[PDB]
mmCIF file of C-alpha atoms and ligand atoms in Angstrom:
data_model
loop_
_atom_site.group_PDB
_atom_site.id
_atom_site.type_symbol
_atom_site.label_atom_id
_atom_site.label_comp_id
_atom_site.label_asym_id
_atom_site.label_seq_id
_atom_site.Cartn_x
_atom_site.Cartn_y
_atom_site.Cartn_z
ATOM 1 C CA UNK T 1 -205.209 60.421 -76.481
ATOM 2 C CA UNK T 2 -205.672 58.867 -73.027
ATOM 3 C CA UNK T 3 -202.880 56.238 -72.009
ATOM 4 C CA UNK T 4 -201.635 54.131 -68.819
ATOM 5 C CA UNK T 5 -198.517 56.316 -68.551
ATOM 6 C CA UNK T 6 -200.024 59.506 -68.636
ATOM 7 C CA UNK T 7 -200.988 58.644 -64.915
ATOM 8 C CA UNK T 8 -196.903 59.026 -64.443
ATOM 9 C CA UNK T 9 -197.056 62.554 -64.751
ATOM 10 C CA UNK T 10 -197.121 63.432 -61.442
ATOM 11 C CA UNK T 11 -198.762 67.137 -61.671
ATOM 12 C CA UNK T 12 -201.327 65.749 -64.839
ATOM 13 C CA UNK T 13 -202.075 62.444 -63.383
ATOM 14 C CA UNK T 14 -205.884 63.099 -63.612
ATOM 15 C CA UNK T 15 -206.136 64.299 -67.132
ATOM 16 C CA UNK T 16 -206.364 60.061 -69.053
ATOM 17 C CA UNK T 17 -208.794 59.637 -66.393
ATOM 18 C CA UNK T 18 -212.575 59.617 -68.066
ATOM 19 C CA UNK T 19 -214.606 62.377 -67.212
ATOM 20 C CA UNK T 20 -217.916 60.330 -65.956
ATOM 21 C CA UNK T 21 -215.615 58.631 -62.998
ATOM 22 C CA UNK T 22 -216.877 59.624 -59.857
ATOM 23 C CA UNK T 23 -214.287 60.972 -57.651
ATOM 24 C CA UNK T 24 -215.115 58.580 -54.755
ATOM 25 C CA UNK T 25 -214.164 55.926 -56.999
ATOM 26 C CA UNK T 26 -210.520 57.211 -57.731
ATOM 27 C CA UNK T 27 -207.730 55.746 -55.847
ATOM 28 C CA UNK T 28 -206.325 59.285 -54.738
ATOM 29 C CA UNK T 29 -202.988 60.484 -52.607
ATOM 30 C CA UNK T 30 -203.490 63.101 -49.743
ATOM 31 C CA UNK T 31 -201.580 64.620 -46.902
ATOM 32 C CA UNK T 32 -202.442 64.791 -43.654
ATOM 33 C CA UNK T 33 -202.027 68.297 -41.853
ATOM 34 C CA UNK T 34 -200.638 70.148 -44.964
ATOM 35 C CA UNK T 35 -199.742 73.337 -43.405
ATOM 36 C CA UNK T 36 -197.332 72.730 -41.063
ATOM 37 C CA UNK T 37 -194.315 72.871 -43.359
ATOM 38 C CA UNK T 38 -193.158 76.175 -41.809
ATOM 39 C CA UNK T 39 -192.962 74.362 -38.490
ATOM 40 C CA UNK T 40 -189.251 75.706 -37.094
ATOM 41 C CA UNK T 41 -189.403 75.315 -33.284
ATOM 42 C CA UNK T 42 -188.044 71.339 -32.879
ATOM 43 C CA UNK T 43 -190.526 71.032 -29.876
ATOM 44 C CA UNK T 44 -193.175 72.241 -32.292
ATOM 45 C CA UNK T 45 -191.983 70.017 -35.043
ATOM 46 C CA UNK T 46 -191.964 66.922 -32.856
ATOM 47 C CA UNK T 47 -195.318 67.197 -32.066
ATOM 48 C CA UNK T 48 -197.297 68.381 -34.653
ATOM 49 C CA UNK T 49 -195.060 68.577 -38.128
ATOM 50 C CA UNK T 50 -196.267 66.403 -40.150
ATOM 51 C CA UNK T 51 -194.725 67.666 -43.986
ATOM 52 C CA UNK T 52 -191.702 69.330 -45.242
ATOM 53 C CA UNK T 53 -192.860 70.434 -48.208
ATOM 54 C CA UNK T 54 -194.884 73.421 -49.037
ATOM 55 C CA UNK T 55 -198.514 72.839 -50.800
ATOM 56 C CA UNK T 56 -197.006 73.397 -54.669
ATOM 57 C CA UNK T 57 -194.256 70.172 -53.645
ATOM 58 C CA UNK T 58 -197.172 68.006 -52.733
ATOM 59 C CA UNK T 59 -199.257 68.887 -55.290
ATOM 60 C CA UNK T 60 -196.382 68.195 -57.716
ATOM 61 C CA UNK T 61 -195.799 64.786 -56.341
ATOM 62 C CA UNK T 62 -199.435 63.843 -56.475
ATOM 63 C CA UNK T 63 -201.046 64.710 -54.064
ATOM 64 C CA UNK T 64 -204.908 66.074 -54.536
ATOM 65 C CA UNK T 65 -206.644 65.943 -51.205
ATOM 66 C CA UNK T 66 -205.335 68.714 -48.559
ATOM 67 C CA UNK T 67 -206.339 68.199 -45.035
ATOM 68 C CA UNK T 68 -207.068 72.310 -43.812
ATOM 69 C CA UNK T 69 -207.594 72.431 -39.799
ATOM 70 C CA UNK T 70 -208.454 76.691 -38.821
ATOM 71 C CA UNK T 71 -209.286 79.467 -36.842
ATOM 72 C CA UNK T 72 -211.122 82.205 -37.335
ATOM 73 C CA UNK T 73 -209.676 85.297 -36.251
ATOM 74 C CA UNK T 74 -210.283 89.134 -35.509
ATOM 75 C CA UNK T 75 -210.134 89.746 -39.147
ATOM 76 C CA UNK T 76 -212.520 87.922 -40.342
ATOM 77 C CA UNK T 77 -210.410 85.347 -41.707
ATOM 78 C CA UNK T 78 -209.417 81.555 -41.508
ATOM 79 C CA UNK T 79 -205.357 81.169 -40.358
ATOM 80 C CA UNK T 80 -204.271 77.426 -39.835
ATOM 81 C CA UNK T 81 -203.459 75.610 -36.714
ATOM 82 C CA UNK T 82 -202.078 72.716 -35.037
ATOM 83 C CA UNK T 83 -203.965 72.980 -31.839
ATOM 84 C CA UNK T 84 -203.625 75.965 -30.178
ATOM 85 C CA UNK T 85 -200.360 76.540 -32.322
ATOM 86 C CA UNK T 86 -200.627 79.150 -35.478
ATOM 87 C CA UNK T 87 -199.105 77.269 -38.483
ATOM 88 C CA UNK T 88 -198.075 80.297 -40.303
ATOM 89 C CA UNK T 89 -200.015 79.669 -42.820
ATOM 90 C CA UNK T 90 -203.371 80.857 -43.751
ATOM 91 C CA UNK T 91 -206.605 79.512 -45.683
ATOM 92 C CA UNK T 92 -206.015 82.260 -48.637
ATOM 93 C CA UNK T 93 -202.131 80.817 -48.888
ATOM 94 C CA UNK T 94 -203.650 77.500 -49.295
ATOM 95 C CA UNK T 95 -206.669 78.494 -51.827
ATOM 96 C CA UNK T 96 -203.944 80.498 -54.103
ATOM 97 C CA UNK T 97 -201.753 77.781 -54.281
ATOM 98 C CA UNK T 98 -204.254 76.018 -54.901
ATOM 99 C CA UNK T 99 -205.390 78.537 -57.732
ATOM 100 C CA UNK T 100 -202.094 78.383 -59.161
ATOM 101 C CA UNK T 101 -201.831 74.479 -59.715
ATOM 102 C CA UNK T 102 -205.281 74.466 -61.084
ATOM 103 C CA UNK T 103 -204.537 77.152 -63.450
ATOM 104 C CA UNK T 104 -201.014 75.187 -64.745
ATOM 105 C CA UNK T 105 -202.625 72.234 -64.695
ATOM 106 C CA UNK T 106 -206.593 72.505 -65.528
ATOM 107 C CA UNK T 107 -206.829 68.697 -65.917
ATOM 108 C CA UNK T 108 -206.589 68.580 -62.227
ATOM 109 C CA UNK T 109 -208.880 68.694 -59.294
ATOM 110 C CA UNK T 110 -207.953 69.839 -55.649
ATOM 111 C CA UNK T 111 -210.036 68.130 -52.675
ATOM 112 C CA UNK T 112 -209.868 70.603 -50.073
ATOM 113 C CA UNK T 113 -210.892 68.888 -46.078
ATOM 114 C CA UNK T 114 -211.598 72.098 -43.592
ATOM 115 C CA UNK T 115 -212.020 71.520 -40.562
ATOM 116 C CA UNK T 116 -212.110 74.440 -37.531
ATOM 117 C CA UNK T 117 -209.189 73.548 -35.313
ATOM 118 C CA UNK T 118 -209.138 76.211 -32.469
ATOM 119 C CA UNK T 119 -211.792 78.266 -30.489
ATOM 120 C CA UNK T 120 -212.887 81.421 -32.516
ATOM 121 C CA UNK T 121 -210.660 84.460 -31.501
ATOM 122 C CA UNK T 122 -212.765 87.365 -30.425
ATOM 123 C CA UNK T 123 -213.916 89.889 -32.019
ATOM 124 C CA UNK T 124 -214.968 88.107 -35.375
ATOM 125 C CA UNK T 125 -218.108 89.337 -37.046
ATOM 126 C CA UNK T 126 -219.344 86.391 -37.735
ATOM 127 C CA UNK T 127 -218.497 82.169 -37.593
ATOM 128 C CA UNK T 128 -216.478 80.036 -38.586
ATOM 129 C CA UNK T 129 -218.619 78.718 -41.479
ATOM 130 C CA UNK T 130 -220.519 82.262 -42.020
ATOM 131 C CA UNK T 131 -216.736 83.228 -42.655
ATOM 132 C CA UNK T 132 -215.365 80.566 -44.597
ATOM 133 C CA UNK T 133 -218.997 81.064 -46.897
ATOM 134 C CA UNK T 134 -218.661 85.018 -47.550
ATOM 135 C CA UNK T 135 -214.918 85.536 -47.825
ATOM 136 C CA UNK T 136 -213.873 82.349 -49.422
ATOM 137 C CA UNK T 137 -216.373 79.982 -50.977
ATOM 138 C CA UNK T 138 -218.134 82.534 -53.165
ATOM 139 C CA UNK T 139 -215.073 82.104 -54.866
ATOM 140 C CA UNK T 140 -216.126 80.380 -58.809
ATOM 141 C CA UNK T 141 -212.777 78.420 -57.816
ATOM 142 C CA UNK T 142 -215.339 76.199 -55.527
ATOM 143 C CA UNK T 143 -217.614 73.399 -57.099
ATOM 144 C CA UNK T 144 -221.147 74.305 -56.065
ATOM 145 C CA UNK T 145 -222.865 71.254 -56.783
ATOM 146 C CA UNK T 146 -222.782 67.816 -54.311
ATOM 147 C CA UNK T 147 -224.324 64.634 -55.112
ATOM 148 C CA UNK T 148 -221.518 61.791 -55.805
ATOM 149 C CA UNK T 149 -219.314 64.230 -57.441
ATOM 150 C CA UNK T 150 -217.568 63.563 -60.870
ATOM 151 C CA UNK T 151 -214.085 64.023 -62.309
ATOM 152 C CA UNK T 152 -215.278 65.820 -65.311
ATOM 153 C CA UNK T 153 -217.438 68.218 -62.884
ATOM 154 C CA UNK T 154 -214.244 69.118 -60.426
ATOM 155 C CA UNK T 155 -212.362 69.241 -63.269
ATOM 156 C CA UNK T 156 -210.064 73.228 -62.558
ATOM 157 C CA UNK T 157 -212.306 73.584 -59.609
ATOM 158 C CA UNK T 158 -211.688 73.241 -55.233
ATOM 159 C CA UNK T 159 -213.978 70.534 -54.374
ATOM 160 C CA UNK T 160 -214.874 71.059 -50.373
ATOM 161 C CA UNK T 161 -214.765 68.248 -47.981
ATOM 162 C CA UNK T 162 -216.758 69.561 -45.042
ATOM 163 C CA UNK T 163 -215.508 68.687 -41.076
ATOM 164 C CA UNK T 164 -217.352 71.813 -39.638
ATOM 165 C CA UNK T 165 -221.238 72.105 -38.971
ATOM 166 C CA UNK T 166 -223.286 74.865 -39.522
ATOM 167 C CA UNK T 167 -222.562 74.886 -43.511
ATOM 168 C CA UNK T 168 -225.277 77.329 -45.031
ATOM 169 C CA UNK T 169 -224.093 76.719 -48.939
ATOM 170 C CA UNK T 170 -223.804 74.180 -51.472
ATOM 171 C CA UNK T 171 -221.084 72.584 -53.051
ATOM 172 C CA UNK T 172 -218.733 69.496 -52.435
ATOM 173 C CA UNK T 173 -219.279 67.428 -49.743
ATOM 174 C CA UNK T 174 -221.752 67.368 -46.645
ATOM 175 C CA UNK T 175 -220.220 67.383 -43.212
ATOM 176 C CA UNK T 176 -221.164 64.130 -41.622
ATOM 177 C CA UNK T 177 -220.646 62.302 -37.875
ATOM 178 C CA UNK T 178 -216.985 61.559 -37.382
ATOM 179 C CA UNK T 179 -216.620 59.421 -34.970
ATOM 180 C CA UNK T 180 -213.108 60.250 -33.048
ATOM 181 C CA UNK T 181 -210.165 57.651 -33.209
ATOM 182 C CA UNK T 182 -211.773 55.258 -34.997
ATOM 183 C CA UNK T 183 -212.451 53.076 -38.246
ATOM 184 C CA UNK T 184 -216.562 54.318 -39.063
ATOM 185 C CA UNK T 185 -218.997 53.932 -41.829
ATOM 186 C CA UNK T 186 -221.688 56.660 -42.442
ATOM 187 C CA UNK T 187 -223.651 58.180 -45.632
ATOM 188 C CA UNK T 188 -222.803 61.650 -47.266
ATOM 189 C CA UNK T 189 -224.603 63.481 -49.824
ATOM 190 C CA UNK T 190 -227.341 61.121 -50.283
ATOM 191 C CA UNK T 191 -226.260 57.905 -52.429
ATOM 192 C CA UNK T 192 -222.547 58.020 -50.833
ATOM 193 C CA UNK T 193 -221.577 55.663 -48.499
ATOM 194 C CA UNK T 194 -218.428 56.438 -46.864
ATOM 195 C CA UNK T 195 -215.880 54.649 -44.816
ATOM 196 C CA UNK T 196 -213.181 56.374 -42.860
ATOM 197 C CA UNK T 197 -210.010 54.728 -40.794
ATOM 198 C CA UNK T 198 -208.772 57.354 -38.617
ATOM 199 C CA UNK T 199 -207.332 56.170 -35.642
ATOM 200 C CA UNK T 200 -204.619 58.860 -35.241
ATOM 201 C CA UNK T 201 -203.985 57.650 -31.654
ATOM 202 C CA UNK T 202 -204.259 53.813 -31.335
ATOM 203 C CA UNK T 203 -200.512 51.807 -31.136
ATOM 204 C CA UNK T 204 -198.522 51.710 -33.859
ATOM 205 C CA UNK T 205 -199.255 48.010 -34.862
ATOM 206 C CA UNK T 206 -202.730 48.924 -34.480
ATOM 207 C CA UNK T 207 -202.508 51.720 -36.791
ATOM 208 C CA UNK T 208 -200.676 49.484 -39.543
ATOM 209 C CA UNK T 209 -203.074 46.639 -39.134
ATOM 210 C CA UNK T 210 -206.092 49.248 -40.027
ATOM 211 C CA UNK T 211 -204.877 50.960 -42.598
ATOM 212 C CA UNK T 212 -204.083 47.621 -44.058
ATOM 213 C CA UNK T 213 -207.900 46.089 -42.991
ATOM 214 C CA UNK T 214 -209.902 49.040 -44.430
ATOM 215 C CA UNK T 215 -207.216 48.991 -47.744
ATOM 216 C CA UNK T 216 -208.299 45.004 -47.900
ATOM 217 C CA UNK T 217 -211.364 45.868 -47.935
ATOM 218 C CA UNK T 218 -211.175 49.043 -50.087
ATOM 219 C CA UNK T 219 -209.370 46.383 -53.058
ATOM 220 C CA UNK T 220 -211.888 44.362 -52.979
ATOM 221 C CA UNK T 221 -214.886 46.170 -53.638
ATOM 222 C CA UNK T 222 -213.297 47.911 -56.607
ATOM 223 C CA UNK T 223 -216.652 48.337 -58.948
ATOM 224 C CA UNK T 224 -218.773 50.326 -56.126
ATOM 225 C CA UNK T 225 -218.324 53.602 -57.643
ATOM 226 C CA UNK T 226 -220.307 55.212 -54.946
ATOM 227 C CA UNK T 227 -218.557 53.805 -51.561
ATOM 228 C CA UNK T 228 -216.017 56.474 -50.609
ATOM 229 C CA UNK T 229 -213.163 55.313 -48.713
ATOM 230 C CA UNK T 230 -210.365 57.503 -47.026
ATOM 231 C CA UNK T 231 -207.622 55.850 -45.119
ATOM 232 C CA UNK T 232 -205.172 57.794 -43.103
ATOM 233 C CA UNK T 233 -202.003 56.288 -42.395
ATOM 234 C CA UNK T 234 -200.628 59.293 -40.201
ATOM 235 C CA UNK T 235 -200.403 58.801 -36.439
ATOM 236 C CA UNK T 236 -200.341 61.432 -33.871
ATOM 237 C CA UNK T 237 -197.194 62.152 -31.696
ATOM 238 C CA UNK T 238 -195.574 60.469 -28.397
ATOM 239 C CA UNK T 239 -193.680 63.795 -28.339
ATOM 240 C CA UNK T 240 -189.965 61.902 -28.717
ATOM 241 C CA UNK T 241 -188.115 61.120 -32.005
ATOM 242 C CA UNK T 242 -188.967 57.753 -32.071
ATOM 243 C CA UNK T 243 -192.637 58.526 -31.773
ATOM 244 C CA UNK T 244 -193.318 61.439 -33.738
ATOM 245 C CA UNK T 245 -195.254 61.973 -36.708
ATOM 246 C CA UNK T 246 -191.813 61.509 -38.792
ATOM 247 C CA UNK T 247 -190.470 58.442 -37.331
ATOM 248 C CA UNK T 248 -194.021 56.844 -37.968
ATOM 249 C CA UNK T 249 -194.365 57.954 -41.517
ATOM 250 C CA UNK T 250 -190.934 56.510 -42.316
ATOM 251 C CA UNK T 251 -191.588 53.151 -41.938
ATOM 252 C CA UNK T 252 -195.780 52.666 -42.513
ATOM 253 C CA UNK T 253 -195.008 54.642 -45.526
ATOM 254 C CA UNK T 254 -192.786 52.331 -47.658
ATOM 255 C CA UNK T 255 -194.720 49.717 -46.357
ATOM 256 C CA UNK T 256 -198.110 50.068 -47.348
ATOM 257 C CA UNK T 257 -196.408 51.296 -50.544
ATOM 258 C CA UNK T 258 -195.533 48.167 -50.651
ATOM 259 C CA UNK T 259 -198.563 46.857 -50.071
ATOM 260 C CA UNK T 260 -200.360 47.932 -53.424
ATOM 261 C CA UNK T 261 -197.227 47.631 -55.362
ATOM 262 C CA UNK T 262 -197.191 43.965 -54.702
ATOM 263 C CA UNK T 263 -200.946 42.974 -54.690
ATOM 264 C CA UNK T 264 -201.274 45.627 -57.647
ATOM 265 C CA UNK T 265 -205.098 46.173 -57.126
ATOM 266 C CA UNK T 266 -207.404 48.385 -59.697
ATOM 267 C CA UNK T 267 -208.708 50.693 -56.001
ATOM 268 C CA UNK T 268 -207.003 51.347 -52.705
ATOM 269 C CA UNK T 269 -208.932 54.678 -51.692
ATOM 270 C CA UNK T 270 -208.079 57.966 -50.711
ATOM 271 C CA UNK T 271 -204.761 57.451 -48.614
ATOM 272 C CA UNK T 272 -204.093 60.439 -46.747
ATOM 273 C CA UNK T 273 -200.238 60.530 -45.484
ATOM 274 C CA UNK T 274 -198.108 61.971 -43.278
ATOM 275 C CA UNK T 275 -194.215 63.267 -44.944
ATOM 276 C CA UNK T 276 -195.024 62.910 -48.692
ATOM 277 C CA UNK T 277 -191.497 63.104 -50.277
ATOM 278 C CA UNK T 278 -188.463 61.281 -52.012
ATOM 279 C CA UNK T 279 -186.900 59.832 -49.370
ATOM 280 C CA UNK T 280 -188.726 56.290 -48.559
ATOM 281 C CA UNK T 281 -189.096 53.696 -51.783
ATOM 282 C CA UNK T 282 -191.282 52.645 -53.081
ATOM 283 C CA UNK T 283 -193.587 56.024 -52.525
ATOM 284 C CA UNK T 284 -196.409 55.565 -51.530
ATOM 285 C CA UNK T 285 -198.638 58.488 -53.401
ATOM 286 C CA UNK T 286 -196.888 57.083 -56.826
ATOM 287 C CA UNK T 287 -198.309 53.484 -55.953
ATOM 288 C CA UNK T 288 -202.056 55.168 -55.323
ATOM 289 C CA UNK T 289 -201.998 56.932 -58.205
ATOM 290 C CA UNK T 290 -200.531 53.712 -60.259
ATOM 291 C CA UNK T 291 -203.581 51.897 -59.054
ATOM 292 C CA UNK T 292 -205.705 53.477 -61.383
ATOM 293 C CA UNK T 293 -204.771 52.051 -64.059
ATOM 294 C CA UNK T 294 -207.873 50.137 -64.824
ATOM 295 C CA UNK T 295 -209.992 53.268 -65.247
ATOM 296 C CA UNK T 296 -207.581 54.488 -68.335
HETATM 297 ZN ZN1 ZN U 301 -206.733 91.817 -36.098
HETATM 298 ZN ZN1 ZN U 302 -196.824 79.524 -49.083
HETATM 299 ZN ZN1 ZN U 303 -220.601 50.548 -50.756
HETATM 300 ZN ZN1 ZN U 304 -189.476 65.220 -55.517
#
C-alpha cells in the first residue's frame, strides 16, 4: 500500500516510507528559528523573524525538524527566544502542537533541535537541562532510545536533537561540538557520523556556495545510511530589508529548490530553511521531500 505519490501528501509524507530507514538517511525539510512567527515589532522582525507561519502551517507543508532556541525562567519553565528577545512562544506551545500533528497524523515523526538561547532568569530551581528533563521529557511523547535512530522507532513520537550540555537522560540524539559559523564533521551517538553547514554569518555568495558544496556532497553519498547531514540555508540579518532573514530566503530558496529539482538526486539531507511558504516556486521543502523517492 506504499507508493511514490503518497510522499505528495504533505502532512503524511512519511507514512510509504519503510519502517527500517534510519532517519539520518531521509532527505528531510526543517525550519530554522520556528518560533518567531508572532514577531510584530518591524525592528524585531528585521532582525530576527525568520517564519510567518505558526508550527501547525509548517508542519502541514512538510516540515519535520523544528529548530527550539530557550530560556529557562522563574517558573521553572522553557519560553523561546531570539537573543535576548522573548518570542512569545513557549516550549509547551511547541510540544502540543507538536502533540496535535502527531496525534492527526501518527505516520509522522517530529525532530525537535533545543538549544538554550539566553542566560537562565533567576530564581529557577533548577537548569536548563534538569528543567527541560523533569517538566518536559518525561513526557512518553519523547523517544527514549538513541543509537542511529529509525523511522519505524520515531514513528508518533518527538525525537530530541540535543544543542545543550549537561543532558542527564536518554533518548534522541547526543549533544555534540558545534563548531560556530562553520561547515564541521563530528560523530553522535556512536556509529553516526554527522556533517553540519551552518555558516549563518558568512556573505551571501558564501552561504549559497555551501549549502550547495555540502548538498554535492550529501547527493553523492546517497547509500551511507549512517552519515547524517543537516544543511541550513538561513542566514542571519544585516538589520536592513535587503539583508534580512526574508530578503535572503527569497532568493536561496527557489534556488536550491532548484537545485534538486533539476539534478533530481535519491538524498539531499536535512535542509533546514528560513520562510517556508507558498510564495517562491519551485518550494523548496516539496523538492526535499520529492527526493525520497528511491526509498518507496
Ligand atoms: Zn514567575
Ligand atoms: Zn501557538
Ligand atoms: Zn559517512
Ligand atoms: Zn500553503
Amino acid at each position: 500500500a506504499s507508493s511514490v505519490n503518497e510522499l505528495e501528501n504533505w502532512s503524511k509524507w512519511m507514512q510509504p516510507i519503510p519502517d527500517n530507514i534510519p532517519l539520518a538517511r531521509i532527505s528531510i525539510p526543517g525550519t530554522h528559528d520556528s518560533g518567531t512567527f508572532k514577531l510584530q515589532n518591524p525592528i524585531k522582525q528585521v532582525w530576527g523573524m525568520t517564519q510567518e507561519y505558526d508550527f501547525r502551517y509548517q508542519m502541514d507543508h512538510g516540515a519535520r525538524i523544528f529548530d527550539i532556541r530557550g530560556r529557562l525562567t522563574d517558573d521553572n519553565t522553557i519560553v523561546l527566544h531570539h537573543g535576548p528577545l522573548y518570542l512569545y512562544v513557549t516550549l509547551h506551545e511547541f510540544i502540543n502542537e507538536a502533540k496535535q500533528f502527531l496525534k492527526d497524523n501518527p505516520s509522522e515523526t517530529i525532530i525537535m533541535s533545543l538549544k538554550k538561547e539566553y542566560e537562565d532568569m533567576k530564581g529557577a530551581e533548577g537548569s536548563f537541562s534538569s528543567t527541560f528533563e523533569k517538566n518536559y521529557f518525561v513526557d512518553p511523547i519523547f523517544l527514549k532510545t538513541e543509537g542511529n535512530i529509525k523511522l519505524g522507532d520515531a514513528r508518533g513520537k518527538i525525537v530530541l536533537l540535543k544543542r545543550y550540555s549537561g543532558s542527564n537522560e536518554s533518548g534522541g540524539y547526543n549533544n555534540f561540538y558545534w563548531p560556530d559559523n562553520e561547515t564541521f564533521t563530528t560523530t553522535v551517538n556512536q556509529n553516526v557520523n554527522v556533517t553540519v553547514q551552518d555558516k549563518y554569518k558568512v556573505n551571501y555568495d558564501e552561504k549559497v556556495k555551501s549549502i550547495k558544496d555540502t548538498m554535492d556532497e550529501t547527493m553523492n553519498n546517497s547509500e551511507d545510511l549512517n552519515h547524517l547531514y543537516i544543511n541550513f540555508t538561513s542566514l542571519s540579518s544585516g538589520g536592513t530589508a535587503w539583508n534580512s532573514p526574508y530578503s535572503y530566503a527569497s532568493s536561496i530558496n527557489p534556488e536550491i529548490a532548484n537545485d534538486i529539482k533539476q539534478k533530481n538526486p535519491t538524498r539531499v539531507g536535512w535542509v533546514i530553511q528560513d520562510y517556508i511558504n507558498e510564495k517562491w516556486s519551485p518550494l523548496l521543502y516539496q523538492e526535499v521531500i520529492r527526493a525520497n523517492k528511491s526509498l518507496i
